[PDB]
């Protein structure tokens, strides 16, 4: 029951956002990242991604690991602290050898977004 984009933006606005972003950029998928448990993992301020359709899940997972563990340390600089992260799509582990389009086609939310979650634990 943690705070998400659904609580921030109405269903009708989200549908409109994703529809026009998908018409404008048909080769990219809209992804929102959400924190799924309470731990030492930080809440990322930027959580909306427009991911190339042919990007591998394993590749996007690598990118997402870094993002979650990086914070701004001024201009030209980012501080990276190593932490173990587990990633989830619709409560399951994203399959590393798939395309990000596949995840989108399989687990896309009715509002048009692919919702993905991170946790410090491997469970849910």
């Amino acid at each position: 029951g943690m705070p998400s984009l659904k609580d921030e933006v109405s269903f009708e606005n989200r549908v409109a956002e994703t529809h026009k972003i998908r018409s404008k950029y048909p080769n990219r998928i809209p992804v929102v990242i959400e924190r799924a448990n309470r731990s030492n993992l930080p809440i990322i301020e930027k959580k909306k991604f427009l991911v190339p359709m042919n990007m591998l899940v394993g590749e996007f997972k690598f990118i997402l690991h870094q993002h979650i563990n990086q914070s701004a340390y001024g201009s030209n600089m980012k501080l990276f602290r190593e932490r173990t992260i587990y990633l989830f799509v619709n409560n399951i582990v994203p399959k590393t050898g798939l395309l990000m389009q596949d995840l989108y086609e399989m687990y896309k939310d009715e509002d048009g977004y692919l919702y993905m979650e991170y946790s410090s634990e491997s469970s849910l």
Binding site: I21, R28, K46, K48, L50, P52, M55, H67
Partner: peptide, 8 residues
């Protein structure tokens, strides 16, 4: 209106 655009 902000999106991150990841690359390879």
């Amino acid at each position: 209106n902000d999106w991150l655009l990841p690359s390879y």
